[PDB]
Amino acid sequence: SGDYGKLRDALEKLKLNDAALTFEPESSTALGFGFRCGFLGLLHAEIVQERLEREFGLSLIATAPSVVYKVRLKS
Amino acid sequence: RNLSALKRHRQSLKRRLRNKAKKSAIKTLSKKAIQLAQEGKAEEALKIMRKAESLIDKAAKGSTLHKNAAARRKSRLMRKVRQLLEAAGAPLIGGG
Amino acid sequence: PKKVLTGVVVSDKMQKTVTVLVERQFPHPLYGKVIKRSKKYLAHDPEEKYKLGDVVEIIESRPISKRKRFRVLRLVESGRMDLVEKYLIRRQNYESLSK
Amino acid sequence: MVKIRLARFGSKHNPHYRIVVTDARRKRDGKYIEKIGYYDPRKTTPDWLKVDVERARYWLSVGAQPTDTARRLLRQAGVFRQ
Amino acid sequence: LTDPIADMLTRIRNATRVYKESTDVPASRFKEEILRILAREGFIKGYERVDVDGKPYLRVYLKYGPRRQGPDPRPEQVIHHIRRISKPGRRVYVGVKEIPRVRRGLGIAILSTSKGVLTDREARKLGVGGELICEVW
Amino acid sequence: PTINQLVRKGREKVRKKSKVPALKGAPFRRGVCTVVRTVTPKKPNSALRKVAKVRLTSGYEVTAYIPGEGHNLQEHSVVLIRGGRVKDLPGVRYHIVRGVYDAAGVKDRKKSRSKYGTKKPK
Amino acid sequence: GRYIGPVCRLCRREGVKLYLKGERCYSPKCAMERRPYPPGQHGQKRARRPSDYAVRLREKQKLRRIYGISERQFRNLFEEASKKKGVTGSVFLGLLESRLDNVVYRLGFAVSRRQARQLVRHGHITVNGRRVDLPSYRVRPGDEIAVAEKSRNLELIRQNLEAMKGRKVGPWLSLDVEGMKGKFLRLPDREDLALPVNEQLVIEFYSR
RNA sequence: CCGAGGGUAGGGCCCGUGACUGGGGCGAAGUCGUAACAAGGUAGCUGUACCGGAAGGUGCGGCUGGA
RNA sequence: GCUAAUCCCCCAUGUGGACCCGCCCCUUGGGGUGUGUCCAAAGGGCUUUGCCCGCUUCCGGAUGGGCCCGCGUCCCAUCAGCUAGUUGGUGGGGUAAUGGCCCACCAAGGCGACGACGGGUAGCCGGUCUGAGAGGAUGGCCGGCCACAGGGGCACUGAGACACGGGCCCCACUCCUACGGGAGGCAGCAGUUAGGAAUCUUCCGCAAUGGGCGCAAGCCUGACGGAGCGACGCCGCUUGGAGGAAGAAGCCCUUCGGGGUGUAAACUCCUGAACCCGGGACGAAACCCCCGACGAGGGGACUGACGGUACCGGGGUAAUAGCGCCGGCCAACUCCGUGCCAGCAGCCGCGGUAAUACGGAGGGCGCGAGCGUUACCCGGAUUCACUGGGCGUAAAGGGCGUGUAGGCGGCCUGGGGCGUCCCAUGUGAAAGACCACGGCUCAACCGUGGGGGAGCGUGGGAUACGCUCAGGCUAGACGG
Numbered sequence A: 001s002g003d004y005g006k007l008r009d010a011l012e013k014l015k016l017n018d019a020a021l022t023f024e025p026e027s028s029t030a031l032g033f034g035f036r037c038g039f040l041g042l043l044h045a046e047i048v049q050e051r052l053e054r055e056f057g058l059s060l061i062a063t064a065p066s067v068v069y070k071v072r073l074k075s
Numbered sequence B: 001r002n003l004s005a006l007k008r009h010r011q012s013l014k015r016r017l018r019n020k021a022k023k024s025a026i027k028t029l030s031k032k033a034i035q036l037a038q039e040g041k042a043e044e045a046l047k048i049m050r051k052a053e054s055l056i057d058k059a060a061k062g063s064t065l066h067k068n069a070a071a072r073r074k075s076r077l078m079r080k081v082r083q084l085l086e087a088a089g090a091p092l093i094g095g096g
Numbered sequence C: 001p002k003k004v005l006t007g008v009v010v011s012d013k014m015q016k017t018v019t020v021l022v023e024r025q026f027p028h029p030l031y032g033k034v035i036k037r038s039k040k041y042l043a044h045d046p047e048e049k050y051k052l053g054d055v056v057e058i059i060e061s062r063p064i065s066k067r068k069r070f071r072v073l074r075l076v077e078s079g080r081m082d083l084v085e086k087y088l089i090r091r092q093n094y095e096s097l098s099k
Numbered sequence D: 001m002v003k004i005r006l007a008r009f010g011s012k013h014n015p016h017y018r019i020v021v022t023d024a025r026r027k028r029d030g031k032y033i034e035k036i037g038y039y040d041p042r043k044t045t046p047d048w049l050k051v052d053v054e055r056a057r058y059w060l061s062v063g064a065q066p067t068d069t070a071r072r073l074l075r076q077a078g079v080f081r082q
Numbered sequence E: 001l002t003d004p005i006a007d008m009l010t011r012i013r014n015a016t017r018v019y020k021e022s023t024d025v026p027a028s029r030f031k032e033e034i035l036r037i038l039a040r041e042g043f044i045k046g047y048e049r050v051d052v053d054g055k056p057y058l059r060v061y062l063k064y065g066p067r068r069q070g071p072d073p074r075p076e077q078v079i080h081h082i083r084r085i086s087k088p089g090r091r092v093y094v095g096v097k098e099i100p101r102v103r104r105g106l107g108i109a110i111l112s113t114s115k116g117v118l119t120d121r122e123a124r125k126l127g128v129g130g131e132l133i134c135e136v137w
Numbered sequence F: 001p002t003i004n005q006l007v008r009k010g011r012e013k014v015r016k017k018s019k020v021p022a023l024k025g026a027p028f029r030r031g032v033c034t035v036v037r038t039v040t041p042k043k044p045n046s047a048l049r050k051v052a053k054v055r056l057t058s059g060y061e062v063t064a065y066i067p068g069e070g071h072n073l074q075e076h077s078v079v080l081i082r083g084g085r086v087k088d089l090p091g092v093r094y095h096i097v098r099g100v101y102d103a104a105g106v107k108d109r110k111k112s113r114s115k116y117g118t119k120k121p122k
Numbered sequence G: 001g002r003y004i005g006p007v008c009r010l011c012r013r014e015g016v017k018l019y020l021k022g023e024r025c026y027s028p029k030c031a032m033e034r035r036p037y038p039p040g041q042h043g044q045k046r047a048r049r050p051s052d053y054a055v056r057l058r059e060k061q062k063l064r065r066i067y068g069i070s071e072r073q074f075r076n077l078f079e080e081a082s083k084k085k086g087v088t089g090s091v092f093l094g095l096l097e098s099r100l101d102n103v104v105y106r107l108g109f110a111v112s113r114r115q116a117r118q119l120v121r122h123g124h125i126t127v128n129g130r131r132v133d134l135p136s137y138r139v140r141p142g143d144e145i146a147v148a149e150k151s152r153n154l155e156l157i158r159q160n161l162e163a164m165k166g167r168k169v170g171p172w173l174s175l176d177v178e179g180m181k182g183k184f185l186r187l188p189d190r191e192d193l194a195l196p197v198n199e200q201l202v203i204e205f206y207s208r
Numbered sequence H: 001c002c003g004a005g006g007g008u009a010g011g012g013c014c015c016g017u018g019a020c021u022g023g024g025g026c027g028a029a030g031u032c033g034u035a036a037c038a039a040g041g042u043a044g045c046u047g048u049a050c051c052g053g054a055a056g057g058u059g060c061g062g063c064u065g066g067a
Numbered sequence I: 001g002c003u004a005a006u007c008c009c010c011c012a013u014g015u016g017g018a019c020c021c022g023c024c025c026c027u028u029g030g031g032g033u034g035u036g037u038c039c040a041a042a043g044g045g046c047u048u049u050g051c052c053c054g055c056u057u058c059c060g061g062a063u064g065g066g067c068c069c070g071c072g073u074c075c076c077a078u079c080a081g082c083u084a085g086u087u088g089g090u091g092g093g094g095u096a097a098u099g100g101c102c103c104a105c106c107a108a109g110g111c112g113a114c115g116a117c118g119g120g121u122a123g124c125c126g127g128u129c130u131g132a133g134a135g136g137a138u139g140g141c142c143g144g145c146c147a148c149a150g151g152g153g154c155a156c157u158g159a160g161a162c163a164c165g166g167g168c169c170c171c172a173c174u175c176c177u178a179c180g181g182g183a184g185g186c187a188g189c190a191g192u193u194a195g196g197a198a199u200c201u202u203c204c205g206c207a208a209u210g211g212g213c214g215c216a217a218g219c220c221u222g223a224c225g226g227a228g229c230g231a232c233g234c235c236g237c238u239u240g241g242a243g244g245a246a247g248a249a250g251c252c253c254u255u256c257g258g259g260g261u262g263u264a265a266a267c268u269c270c271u272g273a274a275c276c277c278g279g280g281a282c283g284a285a286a287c288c289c290c291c292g293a294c295g296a297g298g299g300g301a302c303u304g305a306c307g308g309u310a311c312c313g314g315g316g317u318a319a320u321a322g323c324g325c326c327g328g329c330c331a332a333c334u335c336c337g338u339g340c341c342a343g344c345a346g347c348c349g350c351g352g353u354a355a356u357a358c359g360g361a362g363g364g365c366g367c368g369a370g371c372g373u374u375a376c377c378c379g380g381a382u383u384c385a386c387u388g389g390g391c392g393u394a395a396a397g398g399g400c401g402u403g404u405a406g407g408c409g410g411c412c413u414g415g416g417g418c419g420u421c422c423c424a425u426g427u428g429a430a431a432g433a434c435c436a437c438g439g440c441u442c443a444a445c446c447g448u449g450g451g452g453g454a455g456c457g458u459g460g461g462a463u464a465c466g467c468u469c470a471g472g473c474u475a476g477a478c479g480g
């Protein structure tokens, strides 16, 4: 952080040649503004992160993913 | 990737040499005259002055020298020479 | 027309040059009051015949040096060292305007 | 050299030229030395071509070269009429 | 005394407001020219030059309207308003095209011109301007 | 002051201060929501006022107001702010613009829809 | 463009006949002869001492609706009257009254001003021989306003024209019935139009 | 010779940022007391000095905007 | 190594011109003259014992430029001292040309509270916006000037450049090699990408106007003329017109009697945006050719990107409406819902279970292809007050003297005539604003004419007041 700029840009700047990649923003107490990413297989995930790291000089961390749990209280 | 601006460049080089060569002679012969005048040697001084006067005014037919460039060259040369001679005098042949 | 101004020689100190202090009057553009303004010109004195206190006329001229482009035209009045004294005091007051 | 030429004024599809003496090197609508007449090529008014004959010959006599369209309009005003 | 003219204007102002018959102003020939106009227009009855302990003064003879009816019978003033324009702090000069029109012509402006001391209307009639001395109405 | 004083010192032009510096000095600015919460107003009002802290393209970070009933913004929402304080929320100098970037229009709005960002319903 | 919409409601609000229809206007069928209180749920409640802004506002709206003009165009004509020399209230009425669609209605080619507008706009009117379909045209002194005769045998114009056989035109106009033509003589004096409008209030409106 | 600039060393100004620190503003219903407004229960205020959790108290002289 | 010329050089002629010296006039290096020296030129087409275009030198003109000077040109004094090519001199160098522009030598000077030096910001003007004016704000488009062409330096060629699409070097960056080296500069037109709240077609045509070259034919011209896209702005125009119930339904309100939407709809009549058919432009008459003489004058033909567009005639269809508001300011009110919640808010303030202030509804007001909002400028703000303000207690008299610069100065005469006033004249470009008229069917827009002033230059005049100089006076001031 806030390499975030160089990350959201890397993602966009690579999607426009990747039919399969999907991303979208999500926040996280640690480590902040990131992206929940859909890949079409584990080897496809390996290749994207290798592009980010090796062609965009990005140091990053793959985590999670987590889901939007809805809650119904009493209201 | 082209032009006739390359032509203008090439031609400019030819003229650069021509102007250089002419202004060199003009400076060399004026100095020689003024050096002869400083020793006087007035016969050879006025002769070289006239070949310097010649070159200067031939340079200003074309582009090497402006009219007023030649006139200022000619003025200062004929004043260096004459005044140097006047310090022991005798102006022999053509010139003043 | 070449400009002609009248002023006082305030400085002699220079070879063939006199400083001619020159004053003018005019209404303030907004507040209308008449105010005075002034400007020192270095004037060409080819015969060092002009000296301190000389109220003179200077004429716009072909440049003689840097920042020297008026020639002294004629003398108008002589020995007005009061005019000079005003100037110098003004300058000397500046010694007390520092930090 | 100096020129007698048309400077376009007017609006879109409404050309109104001033016939104008100016240096050749200015843009056609820029500063001109003198306005010696006008010209409405669509003849939308009775007097669609005025020329101050005296000044035109003065600039003519002094060396100002009329274009071609300006020459024709000057001619058509008998400026060259011997 | 920094402005004699102003002092005359205030000497006349302060006296009329208490309905004096007369008031003295120290003598000067410029002031006479001004008084002369105030006389010539009927803002004052007139003046004479007097001696007050051997010094020269100008006794101005003041003028009012008729005694009025009702509570407060004090007469209307002839000189309602007399005030300096040009002053030692700011001199005020006008060209002939900038002569003001005091109270739509029910008042006057007095000026000093190189053709004499004039009113706004003689100034315009002699085609000259000058220093705007005062307005009176 | 005297005329002379005015000649010596002039009058001072009074120079207006911007209530809206983070715009710098455009009419709107884009940003990413970093915090989205409710805030309470000052006296004499009681409410749970809806608000975002916004990191701007201008480099500023500001708290903006989310007008209208209901909203769809969470942390990391891209947003557009206009000038305009909310008087009950000291610190809130700007309004988010409904219906731009990730900010939905106000749902079921029928009046004043051009504010609140709501298209004319069929 | 122009308003288009119920107009009785307009005359009802202004509290006076604006004669926005021609024929029904002089009938007892008019809502003003019939129910002369402003439209909506509250027309029948008691009034409230109008603010002085409303009195000028309603006076300006009155004069403007009469002629069917936009506020944009009404505002420009008023600005011209003001910037022009001469008493602004009158030059304003003159400038309004010099309108083409208005001179058509005033002449009698149409029963109402909205119709004259359509008459001008549909090509049925000529200024000095040439067809002129612009409703805001500035008719000038000595202009001949006439019916384009390729629509001279038109059932509306004939009817309305025959209705002028007899009726007088304003002291500032002339009309050759069955010539189907008229002149704008001079521009009208304020006394000529008996308008239900204190136009100086309009001046006070726009000087707020 | 001069010369873009590179370099070496030393100054000056400005901006950003900094563990920690100073006080400030603001914030619907926290804690302590009650200094001022009515000889506000020791008339008030005041410049300085010293002291005290806090307002403040006291001294010296001043003001009346207290008798 | 070959070779031509309107390429280069040399000899000649010298109308003239340049330079040194003398002399005359003139007065900064302007003009005339004498002797000495020095300086020119180019050919091409043709119908040919003549014409066309070139060519050399000179003087003058015209135009355009360089340099210099007076005056005006933002913020901070919490920037107060600055200056060694610095200021001047002498002689040189350089240039078209003055100058410390450059250099050598000599002198010790120059500048600054009338703001030097430093910092910050900024292209400047005609104008534009606002304003009662005065003033304030601004410099987009168009016109004028300046500056810059990736960052920096440099000079060459030339009438002119230190040259955006010319050259050289260094740097940053990007791109190509075969490894030696090499390529590039959209702040031209389109266009891409990035940044951004946001800003357009990789269009058409050289028909017009203007430019360059050519004797001309003609060639090139992203100048320009147009077309495209964007309600971005202004102007014009339409979504109909007339009739049509004490008055449908629906919907809202209701004291359930009634009121409202509303002549609004329906429905009758008739007009005819769109669209269809036919026609169909102005802008284009010069260049050129012919007669004459290549001239004046006459006569003649060619040429349209826009565009099969505008526009005209004929036919022809009832045919987009929205947005803001309705507590006060401020034009427009009722019902329901909600219950300090949810929400509104420019200020005042509104919401705590009977809200004209929140949300919806019906009605209403405002404007209408728009309407609102945000940002900013002037106004309202005489709230920086020149016009046009204040200071006992509202903000605001320095703690009190003494005094420097400065500002200001009683009564009388003369000289000057700086301020000031007058008159004449020059300049105040064009566009724009204003008035008048005129052209597009109107208007917007455009054209022609007109009045502009202030300011500044020149010349003439005036002299009351302010000034200056000279001289007085005794009333202010000081002394005895």
Ligand code: SF4
Residues within 6 Å of the ligand: G007, G008, G009, G011, G012, G016, G017, G018, G019, G020, G021, G022, G024, G025, G026, G029, G030, G031, G032, G033
């Ligand atoms: S009818 Fe009566 S109300 Fe309806 S328009 Fe004619 S006048 Fe106005």
Ligand SMILES: [Mg+2]
Residues within 6 Å of the ligand: B028
């Ligand atoms: Mg040699």
Ligand SMILES: [Mg+2]
Residues within 6 Å of the ligand: C064, C065
């Ligand atoms: Mg010198």
Ligand SMILES: [Mg+2]
Residues within 6 Å of the ligand: F044, F045, F046, I340
């Ligand atoms: Mg409350």
Ligand SMILES: [Mg+2]
Residues within 6 Å of the ligand: F044, F045, F046, I340
């Ligand atoms: Mg409340």
Ligand SMILES: [Mg+2]
Residues within 6 Å of the ligand: F110, F111, F112, F113, F114
């Ligand atoms: Mg709405």
Ligand SMILES: [Mg+2]
Residues within 6 Å of the ligand: G206, G207, G208
């Ligand atoms: Mg107004």
Ligand SMILES: [Mg+2]
Residues within 6 Å of the ligand: none
């Ligand atoms: Mg260096």
Ligand SMILES: [Mg+2]
Residues within 6 Å of the ligand: H005, H006
């Ligand atoms: Mg280097």
Ligand SMILES: [Mg+2]
Residues within 6 Å of the ligand: none
């Ligand atoms: Mg620090």
Ligand SMILES: [Mg+2]
Residues within 6 Å of the ligand: none
């Ligand atoms: Mg801190």
Ligand SMILES: [Mg+2]
Residues within 6 Å of the ligand: H035
């Ligand atoms: Mg106490």
Ligand SMILES: [Mg+2]
Residues within 6 Å of the ligand: H034, H035, H040
């Ligand atoms: Mg107490």
Ligand SMILES: [Mg+2]
Residues within 6 Å of the ligand: H041
């Ligand atoms: Mg107590």
Ligand SMILES: [Mg+2]
Residues within 6 Å of the ligand: H042
């Ligand atoms: Mg007490």
Ligand SMILES: [Mg+2]
Residues within 6 Å of the ligand: none
């Ligand atoms: Mg104490």
